[PDB]
Amino acid sequence: VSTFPLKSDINITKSGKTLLSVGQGGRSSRTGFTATVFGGTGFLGRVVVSKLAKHGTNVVVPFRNDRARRQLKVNGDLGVVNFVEFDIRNLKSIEDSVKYSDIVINLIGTEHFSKNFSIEDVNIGAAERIAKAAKEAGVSRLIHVSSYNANPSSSSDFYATKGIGEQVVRDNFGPDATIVRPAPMYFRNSPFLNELLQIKALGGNVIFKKEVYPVHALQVGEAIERIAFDDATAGQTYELFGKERYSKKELREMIKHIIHIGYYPYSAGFYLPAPEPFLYAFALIRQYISSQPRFNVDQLKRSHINQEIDQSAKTFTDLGMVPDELSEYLYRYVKPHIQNRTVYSKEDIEKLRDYVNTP
Protein backbone atom coordinates (compact mmCIF):
# COMPACT_ATOMS: atom_id res chain seq x y z
CA VAL A 1 0.00 0.00 0.00
CA SER A 2 1.99 2.95 1.38
CA THR A 3 1.55 5.34 -1.56
CA PHE A 4 1.76 3.20 -4.72
CA PRO A 5 1.78 -0.61 -4.95
CA LEU A 6 3.19 -1.22 -8.43
CA LYS A 7 6.93 -1.81 -8.61
CA SER A 8 7.10 -0.18 -12.06
CA ASP A 9 4.60 2.00 -13.89
CA ILE A 10 4.61 -0.12 -17.06
CA ASN A 11 4.10 -3.86 -16.63
CA ILE A 12 3.80 -6.36 -19.48
CA THR A 13 1.67 -9.42 -18.76
CA LYS A 14 2.23 -12.94 -20.09
CA SER A 15 -0.28 -12.17 -22.87
CA GLY A 16 1.63 -9.22 -24.35
CA LYS A 17 -0.67 -6.49 -23.03
CA THR A 18 1.27 -3.36 -22.06
CA LEU A 19 -0.40 -1.81 -19.02
CA LEU A 20 0.56 1.71 -17.90
CA SER A 21 -0.42 2.86 -14.43
CA VAL A 22 -1.45 6.48 -13.93
CA GLY A 23 -1.75 8.77 -10.94
CA GLN A 24 0.04 8.84 -7.61
CA GLY A 25 -1.83 5.82 -6.23
CA GLY A 26 -4.97 7.46 -4.87
CA ARG A 27 -8.61 6.52 -5.24
CA SER A 28 -8.74 8.33 -8.58
CA SER A 29 -5.58 6.62 -9.83
CA ARG A 30 -5.46 3.47 -11.96
CA THR A 31 -3.15 0.54 -12.65
CA GLY A 32 -4.51 -0.78 -15.95
CA PHE A 33 -5.19 -4.29 -14.63
CA THR A 34 -8.47 -6.17 -14.28
CA ALA A 35 -8.36 -8.62 -11.38
CA THR A 36 -11.38 -10.93 -11.28
CA VAL A 37 -11.68 -11.99 -7.63
CA PHE A 38 -13.89 -15.06 -7.50
CA GLY A 39 -15.63 -15.48 -4.17
CA GLY A 40 -14.96 -11.84 -3.37
CA THR A 41 -18.06 -11.50 -1.19
CA GLY A 42 -16.54 -13.86 1.39
CA PHE A 43 -14.38 -13.15 4.41
CA LEU A 44 -11.12 -13.36 2.48
CA GLY A 45 -12.46 -11.69 -0.65
CA ARG A 46 -13.51 -8.50 1.12
CA VAL A 47 -9.83 -7.96 1.93
CA VAL A 48 -8.53 -9.05 -1.49
CA VAL A 49 -11.10 -6.87 -3.26
CA SER A 50 -10.57 -3.85 -1.01
CA LYS A 51 -6.81 -3.62 -1.57
CA LEU A 52 -7.08 -4.11 -5.34
CA ALA A 53 -9.73 -1.42 -5.85
CA LYS A 54 -8.22 1.37 -3.74
CA HIS A 55 -5.05 1.27 -5.86
CA GLY A 56 -6.91 1.50 -9.17
CA THR A 57 -7.21 -2.10 -10.38
CA ASN A 58 -10.56 -2.97 -11.93
CA VAL A 59 -12.18 -5.77 -9.94
CA VAL A 60 -14.81 -8.06 -11.43
CA VAL A 61 -16.50 -9.82 -8.52
CA PRO A 62 -18.78 -12.72 -9.51
CA PHE A 63 -21.43 -13.19 -6.84
CA ARG A 64 -24.37 -15.44 -6.10
CA ASN A 65 -25.79 -13.39 -3.20
CA ASP A 66 -27.26 -10.10 -4.37
CA ARG A 67 -27.39 -8.25 -1.05
CA ALA A 68 -23.76 -8.97 -0.10
CA ARG A 69 -22.11 -7.35 -3.14
CA ARG A 70 -23.42 -3.85 -2.37
CA GLN A 71 -20.71 -2.99 0.15
CA LEU A 72 -17.83 -3.98 -2.13
CA LYS A 73 -18.39 -0.95 -4.39
CA VAL A 74 -17.44 1.60 -1.72
CA ASN A 75 -13.76 0.67 -1.98
CA GLY A 76 -13.30 1.53 -5.65
CA ASP A 77 -14.05 4.60 -7.72
CA LEU A 78 -16.68 4.85 -10.47
CA GLY A 79 -16.37 1.79 -12.70
CA VAL A 80 -13.51 0.27 -10.70
CA VAL A 81 -15.60 -2.44 -9.04
CA ASN A 82 -17.77 -4.50 -11.40
CA PHE A 83 -20.31 -7.22 -10.70
CA VAL A 84 -21.34 -10.36 -12.57
CA GLU A 85 -24.11 -12.68 -11.44
CA PHE A 86 -23.02 -16.29 -11.76
CA ASP A 87 -23.13 -19.83 -10.45
CA ILE A 88 -20.46 -22.51 -10.78
CA ARG A 89 -23.03 -24.55 -12.70
CA ASN A 90 -23.46 -21.72 -15.24
CA LEU A 91 -20.43 -21.92 -17.53
CA LYS A 92 -21.44 -18.90 -19.62
CA SER A 93 -21.54 -16.62 -16.57
CA ILE A 94 -18.02 -17.76 -15.66
CA GLU A 95 -16.72 -16.59 -19.04
CA ASP A 96 -18.28 -13.16 -18.43
CA SER A 97 -15.91 -12.48 -15.52
CA VAL A 98 -12.70 -13.55 -17.29
CA LYS A 99 -13.08 -12.03 -20.77
CA TYR A 100 -11.40 -8.72 -19.84
CA SER A 101 -9.43 -10.01 -16.84
CA ASP A 102 -5.64 -9.90 -16.64
CA ILE A 103 -5.58 -11.32 -13.09
CA VAL A 104 -7.80 -14.19 -11.94
CA ILE A 105 -7.91 -15.05 -8.24
CA ASN A 106 -9.66 -18.13 -6.86
CA LEU A 107 -10.98 -18.01 -3.31
CA ILE A 108 -13.97 -20.36 -3.53
CA GLY A 109 -13.65 -23.07 -0.90
CA THR A 110 -16.12 -24.71 1.48
CA GLU A 111 -15.97 -26.95 4.52
CA HIS A 112 -19.62 -28.08 4.61
CA PHE A 113 -21.38 -29.83 1.75
CA SER A 114 -24.92 -28.62 1.10
CA LYS A 115 -28.02 -29.92 -0.67
CA ASN A 116 -26.60 -28.48 -3.88
CA PHE A 117 -22.81 -28.92 -3.65
CA SER A 118 -20.35 -31.40 -2.18
CA ILE A 119 -16.92 -30.59 -0.77
CA GLU A 120 -15.29 -31.93 -3.94
CA ASP A 121 -17.68 -30.05 -6.24
CA VAL A 122 -16.46 -26.72 -4.85
CA ASN A 123 -12.79 -27.15 -3.96
CA ILE A 124 -12.33 -29.03 -7.26
CA GLY A 125 -15.34 -28.71 -9.54
CA ALA A 126 -15.51 -24.94 -9.13
CA ALA A 127 -11.72 -24.59 -9.21
CA GLU A 128 -11.30 -26.82 -12.26
CA ARG A 129 -13.96 -24.99 -14.26
CA ILE A 130 -12.68 -21.58 -13.15
CA ALA A 131 -9.03 -22.31 -13.93
CA LYS A 132 -9.60 -24.01 -17.30
CA ALA A 133 -12.08 -21.36 -18.45
CA ALA A 134 -9.68 -18.55 -17.52
CA LYS A 135 -6.90 -20.00 -19.69
CA GLU A 136 -9.06 -20.11 -22.82
CA ALA A 137 -9.61 -16.34 -22.51
CA GLY A 138 -5.89 -15.54 -22.47
CA VAL A 139 -5.71 -14.71 -18.76
CA SER A 140 -2.10 -13.83 -18.00
CA ARG A 141 -1.97 -14.83 -14.32
CA LEU A 142 -3.95 -17.16 -12.08
CA ILE A 143 -3.68 -17.21 -8.29
CA HIS A 144 -5.28 -19.93 -6.18
CA VAL A 145 -6.00 -20.40 -2.48
CA SER A 146 -6.17 -23.87 -0.91
CA SER A 147 -6.04 -25.33 2.57
CA TYR A 148 -2.96 -24.99 4.76
CA ASN A 149 -2.77 -28.81 4.98
CA ALA A 150 -3.50 -29.87 1.42
CA ASN A 151 -2.93 -33.59 0.92
CA PRO A 152 -4.26 -35.75 -1.93
CA SER A 153 -4.28 -38.88 0.26
CA SER A 154 -5.69 -37.36 3.46
CA SER A 155 -8.72 -38.98 5.09
CA SER A 156 -10.22 -35.55 5.81
CA ASP A 157 -12.60 -34.56 3.01
CA PHE A 158 -11.55 -30.90 3.13
CA TYR A 159 -7.83 -31.66 2.92
CA ALA A 160 -8.28 -34.41 0.32
CA THR A 161 -10.36 -32.29 -2.07
CA LYS A 162 -8.25 -29.16 -1.54
CA GLY A 163 -5.13 -31.13 -2.47
CA ILE A 164 -6.75 -32.53 -5.60
CA GLY A 165 -7.77 -28.93 -6.29
CA GLU A 166 -4.08 -28.13 -6.67
CA GLN A 167 -3.56 -30.93 -9.21
CA VAL A 168 -6.69 -30.35 -11.29
CA VAL A 169 -5.88 -26.65 -11.69
CA ARG A 170 -2.34 -27.31 -12.91
CA ASP A 171 -3.73 -29.80 -15.42
CA ASN A 172 -6.17 -27.11 -16.61
CA PHE A 173 -4.60 -23.65 -16.29
CA GLY A 174 -1.09 -24.99 -16.81
CA PRO A 175 2.36 -24.04 -15.53
CA ASP A 176 1.40 -20.38 -15.05
CA ALA A 177 -1.00 -21.02 -12.16
CA THR A 178 0.04 -20.28 -8.58
CA ILE A 179 -1.10 -21.92 -5.35
CA VAL A 180 -1.13 -20.10 -2.00
CA ARG A 181 -1.86 -21.91 1.26
CA PRO A 182 -3.07 -19.63 4.08
CA ALA A 183 -2.90 -20.57 7.73
CA PRO A 184 -6.05 -19.88 9.79
CA MET A 185 -6.40 -16.11 9.52
CA TYR A 186 -7.72 -13.94 12.34
CA PHE A 187 -9.66 -10.75 11.65
CA ARG A 188 -13.01 -9.14 12.33
CA ASN A 189 -15.71 -11.81 11.97
CA SER A 190 -13.06 -14.42 11.23
CA PRO A 191 -14.48 -17.97 11.02
CA PHE A 192 -11.32 -19.11 12.82
CA LEU A 193 -12.13 -16.96 15.86
CA ASN A 194 -15.94 -17.12 15.73
CA GLU A 195 -15.78 -20.70 17.03
CA LEU A 196 -13.64 -19.63 20.00
CA LEU A 197 -15.92 -16.78 21.10
CA GLN A 198 -19.10 -18.89 21.03
CA ILE A 199 -20.29 -19.61 24.57
CA LYS A 200 -22.19 -22.84 23.78
CA ALA A 201 -19.41 -24.81 22.10
CA LEU A 202 -20.34 -28.47 22.51
CA GLY A 203 -17.29 -30.71 22.52
CA GLY A 204 -15.09 -27.75 23.42
CA ASN A 205 -12.28 -29.93 24.75
CA VAL A 206 -12.18 -32.07 21.60
CA ILE A 207 -12.55 -29.24 19.08
CA PHE A 208 -9.97 -26.92 20.64
CA LYS A 209 -7.09 -29.36 21.19
CA LYS A 210 -6.03 -28.90 17.55
CA GLU A 211 -2.86 -26.93 16.78
CA VAL A 212 -2.42 -24.06 14.31
CA TYR A 213 -0.03 -21.34 13.07
CA PRO A 214 -2.27 -18.26 13.10
CA VAL A 215 -1.59 -15.56 10.50
CA HIS A 216 -2.89 -12.00 10.31
CA ALA A 217 -5.48 -11.77 7.54
CA LEU A 218 -4.29 -8.32 6.43
CA GLN A 219 -0.85 -9.68 5.53
CA VAL A 220 -2.39 -12.54 3.55
CA GLY A 221 -4.58 -9.88 1.98
CA GLU A 222 -1.42 -8.06 0.97
CA ALA A 223 0.29 -11.37 0.19
CA ILE A 224 -2.05 -11.91 -2.74
CA GLU A 225 -1.66 -8.22 -3.60
CA ARG A 226 2.13 -8.57 -3.81
CA ILE A 227 1.80 -11.70 -5.94
CA ALA A 228 -0.83 -10.12 -8.20
CA PHE A 229 1.38 -7.34 -9.56
CA ASP A 230 4.38 -9.65 -10.11
CA ASP A 231 4.90 -12.17 -12.91
CA ALA A 232 8.03 -13.62 -11.28
CA THR A 233 5.82 -15.68 -8.94
CA ALA A 234 4.16 -18.02 -11.44
CA GLY A 235 4.00 -21.77 -10.93
CA GLN A 236 4.92 -21.62 -7.25
CA THR A 237 3.44 -22.97 -4.02
CA TYR A 238 3.22 -20.62 -1.03
CA GLU A 239 2.37 -21.50 2.57
CA LEU A 240 1.73 -18.48 4.79
CA PHE A 241 1.80 -18.88 8.57
CA GLY A 242 2.79 -17.11 11.77
CA LYS A 243 6.00 -17.62 13.71
CA GLU A 244 4.63 -18.16 17.21
CA ARG A 245 2.68 -21.40 17.55
CA TYR A 246 -0.73 -21.32 19.25
CA SER A 247 -3.40 -23.91 19.99
CA LYS A 248 -7.14 -23.33 20.14
CA LYS A 249 -7.45 -24.47 23.76
CA GLU A 250 -4.58 -22.13 24.59
CA LEU A 251 -6.49 -19.39 22.78
CA ARG A 252 -9.94 -20.25 24.15
CA GLU A 253 -8.87 -19.77 27.76
CA MET A 254 -6.74 -16.79 26.70
CA ILE A 255 -9.79 -15.33 24.94
CA LYS A 256 -12.11 -15.99 27.87
CA HIS A 257 -9.70 -14.52 30.41
CA ILE A 258 -9.60 -11.18 28.59
CA ILE A 259 -13.41 -11.07 28.65
CA HIS A 260 -13.21 -12.02 32.37
CA ILE A 261 -15.84 -14.74 31.87
CA GLY A 262 -16.59 -17.83 39.31
CA TYR A 263 -19.62 -20.05 38.80
CA TYR A 264 -20.43 -18.80 35.29
CA PRO A 265 -18.17 -20.99 33.09
CA TYR A 266 -19.46 -24.08 34.91
CA SER A 267 -23.11 -23.19 34.20
CA ALA A 268 -23.49 -21.14 31.00
CA GLY A 269 -21.98 -23.98 28.98
CA PHE A 270 -18.31 -23.10 28.43
CA TYR A 271 -17.09 -26.67 29.03
CA LEU A 272 -19.43 -29.37 27.67
CA PRO A 273 -17.86 -32.82 28.02
CA ALA A 274 -19.86 -34.93 25.58
CA PRO A 275 -19.23 -38.47 24.34
CA GLU A 276 -17.45 -38.93 21.03
CA PRO A 277 -20.40 -40.85 19.49
CA PHE A 278 -22.77 -38.06 20.54
CA LEU A 279 -20.68 -35.44 18.73
CA TYR A 280 -20.58 -37.65 15.64
CA ALA A 281 -24.31 -38.32 15.89
CA PHE A 282 -25.25 -34.69 16.56
CA ALA A 283 -23.38 -33.44 13.49
CA LEU A 284 -25.03 -36.06 11.29
CA ILE A 285 -28.52 -35.26 12.60
CA ARG A 286 -28.20 -31.52 12.01
CA GLN A 287 -26.80 -32.20 8.53
CA TYR A 288 -30.35 -33.11 7.46
CA ILE A 289 -32.29 -30.89 9.89
CA SER A 290 -30.26 -27.67 9.92
CA SER A 291 -30.71 -24.87 7.40
CA GLN A 292 -27.55 -22.86 8.21
CA PRO A 293 -23.99 -24.26 8.03
CA ARG A 294 -23.29 -25.90 11.39
CA PHE A 295 -20.41 -27.93 12.83
CA ASN A 296 -19.65 -30.73 10.39
CA VAL A 297 -18.40 -34.29 10.63
CA ASP A 298 -15.26 -33.24 8.75
CA GLN A 299 -14.28 -30.78 11.48
CA LEU A 300 -14.52 -33.64 13.99
CA LYS A 301 -11.62 -35.37 12.23
CA ARG A 302 -9.66 -32.15 11.59
CA SER A 303 -9.65 -31.55 15.35
CA HIS A 304 -7.40 -34.62 15.67
CA ILE A 305 -4.97 -33.40 12.96
CA ASN A 306 -2.41 -30.70 13.67
CA GLN A 307 -1.17 -28.11 11.19
CA GLU A 308 1.84 -29.21 9.13
CA ILE A 309 4.39 -26.89 7.52
CA ASP A 310 5.47 -28.04 4.06
CA GLN A 311 9.13 -27.38 3.29
CA SER A 312 8.70 -27.45 -0.50
CA ALA A 313 6.74 -24.18 -0.24
CA LYS A 314 7.81 -20.57 0.29
CA THR A 315 7.25 -18.30 3.29
CA PHE A 316 6.35 -14.63 3.66
CA THR A 317 9.99 -13.50 3.50
CA ASP A 318 10.12 -14.87 -0.05
CA LEU A 319 7.85 -11.94 -0.94
CA GLY A 320 9.75 -9.47 1.26
CA MET A 321 7.10 -9.34 4.00
CA VAL A 322 7.71 -10.29 7.64
CA PRO A 323 4.66 -12.09 9.09
CA ASP A 324 3.03 -10.57 12.15
CA GLU A 325 2.27 -12.49 15.33
CA LEU A 326 -1.12 -13.15 16.90
CA SER A 327 0.22 -11.59 20.12
CA GLU A 328 0.28 -8.08 18.64
CA TYR A 329 -3.30 -8.32 17.30
CA LEU A 330 -5.33 -10.87 19.30
CA TYR A 331 -6.64 -8.32 21.81
CA ARG A 332 -8.02 -5.77 19.34
CA TYR A 333 -10.00 -8.31 17.33
CA VAL A 334 -11.89 -9.48 20.44
CA LYS A 335 -12.10 -5.95 21.90
CA PRO A 336 -15.71 -5.82 20.61
CA HIS A 337 -16.65 -8.75 22.85
CA ILE A 338 -15.00 -7.60 26.09
CA GLN A 339 -13.69 1.33 35.51
CA ASN A 340 -10.53 1.40 33.39
CA ARG A 341 -9.97 -0.76 30.32
CA THR A 342 -6.90 -2.99 30.56
CA VAL A 343 -5.22 -3.08 27.14
CA TYR A 344 -3.27 -6.34 26.81
CA SER A 345 -0.24 -5.20 24.83
CA LYS A 346 1.91 -7.39 22.60
CA GLU A 347 4.29 -8.55 25.34
CA ASP A 348 1.53 -8.90 27.93
CA ILE A 349 -0.16 -11.65 25.90
CA GLU A 350 2.59 -14.00 27.07
CA LYS A 351 1.86 -13.01 30.67
CA LEU A 352 -1.77 -13.86 29.94
CA ARG A 353 -0.56 -17.01 28.18
CA ASP A 354 1.49 -17.74 31.29
CA TYR A 355 -1.64 -17.50 33.45
CA VAL A 356 -3.50 -20.02 31.27
CA ASN A 357 -0.77 -22.67 31.40
CA THR A 358 -0.34 -22.43 35.18
CA PRO A 359 -2.51 -25.10 36.92
Partner: protein, 78 residues
Protein backbone atom coordinates in the same frame (compact mmCIF):
# COMPACT_ATOMS: atom_id res chain seq x y z
CA UNK B 1 -52.81 -16.26 38.24
CA UNK B 2 -49.93 -14.21 36.93
CA UNK B 3 -47.30 -16.90 37.43
CA UNK B 4 -49.25 -19.35 35.26
CA UNK B 5 -48.79 -16.95 32.37
CA UNK B 6 -45.22 -16.03 33.34
CA UNK B 7 -44.12 -19.62 33.98
CA UNK B 8 -43.73 -20.54 30.27
CA UNK B 9 -41.41 -17.59 29.68
CA UNK B 10 -39.11 -18.00 32.69
CA UNK B 11 -38.59 -21.75 32.27
CA UNK B 12 -37.48 -21.12 28.69
CA UNK B 13 -35.11 -18.38 29.85
CA UNK B 14 -33.75 -20.61 32.62
CA UNK B 15 -32.43 -23.25 30.21
CA UNK B 16 -31.15 -20.73 27.66
CA UNK B 17 -29.35 -18.54 30.20
CA UNK B 18 -27.83 -21.27 32.40
CA UNK B 19 -28.30 -24.62 30.64
CA UNK B 20 -26.12 -26.73 32.95
CA UNK B 21 -27.69 -25.29 36.09
CA UNK B 22 -31.17 -25.67 34.63
CA UNK B 23 -30.68 -29.39 33.98
CA UNK B 24 -30.03 -29.99 37.68
CA UNK B 25 -32.57 -27.84 39.54
CA UNK B 26 -35.29 -28.93 37.11
CA UNK B 27 -33.86 -32.44 37.12
CA UNK B 28 -33.74 -32.48 40.90
CA UNK B 29 -37.28 -31.11 41.04
CA UNK B 30 -38.57 -34.01 38.93
CA UNK B 31 -36.91 -36.50 41.28
CA UNK B 32 -38.90 -35.46 44.35
CA UNK B 33 -42.08 -35.09 42.29
CA UNK B 34 -41.53 -38.63 41.03
CA UNK B 35 -40.56 -39.75 44.53
CA UNK B 36 -43.92 -38.70 45.96
CA UNK B 37 -45.72 -40.15 42.93
CA UNK B 38 -44.12 -43.58 43.32
CA UNK B 39 -44.09 -43.78 47.15
CA UNK B 40 -40.33 -44.29 47.18
CA UNK B 41 -40.36 -43.55 50.90
CA UNK B 42 -37.18 -41.48 50.72
CA UNK B 43 -38.37 -38.02 51.78
CA UNK B 44 -40.57 -39.69 54.40
CA UNK B 45 -37.52 -41.40 55.91
CA UNK B 46 -35.40 -38.26 55.62
CA UNK B 47 -38.21 -36.64 57.60
CA UNK B 48 -38.47 -39.40 60.21
CA UNK B 49 -34.72 -39.14 60.81
CA UNK B 50 -35.03 -35.48 61.83
CA UNK B 51 -37.96 -36.10 64.17
CA UNK B 52 -36.03 -38.87 65.93
CA UNK B 53 -32.80 -36.93 66.49
CA UNK B 54 -34.52 -33.71 67.61
CA UNK B 55 -36.76 -35.40 70.18
CA UNK B 56 -39.99 -34.82 68.27
CA UNK B 57 -42.94 -37.20 68.61
CA UNK B 58 -42.28 -39.55 65.70
CA UNK B 59 -44.88 -41.62 63.89
CA UNK B 60 -43.33 -44.83 65.21
CA UNK B 61 -43.31 -43.53 68.79
CA UNK B 62 -47.06 -42.86 68.79
CA UNK B 63 -47.83 -46.34 67.50
CA UNK B 64 -45.49 -47.71 70.18
CA UNK B 65 -47.37 -45.53 72.68
CA UNK B 66 -50.67 -47.02 71.52
CA UNK B 67 -49.29 -50.53 71.93
CA UNK B 68 -48.29 -49.77 75.52
CA UNK B 69 -51.76 -48.40 76.26
CA UNK B 70 -53.39 -51.26 74.35
CA UNK B 71 -51.36 -53.94 76.13
CA UNK B 72 -52.07 -52.40 79.53
CA UNK B 73 -55.84 -52.07 79.14
CA UNK B 74 -56.27 -55.62 77.83
CA UNK B 75 -54.55 -57.14 80.87
CA UNK B 76 -56.64 -54.87 83.10
CA UNK B 77 -59.78 -56.74 82.04
CA UNK B 78 -58.18 -60.05 83.05
Amino acid sequence: PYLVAFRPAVLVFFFIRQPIGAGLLAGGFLFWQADRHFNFGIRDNIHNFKQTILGFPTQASKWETFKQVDAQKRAQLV
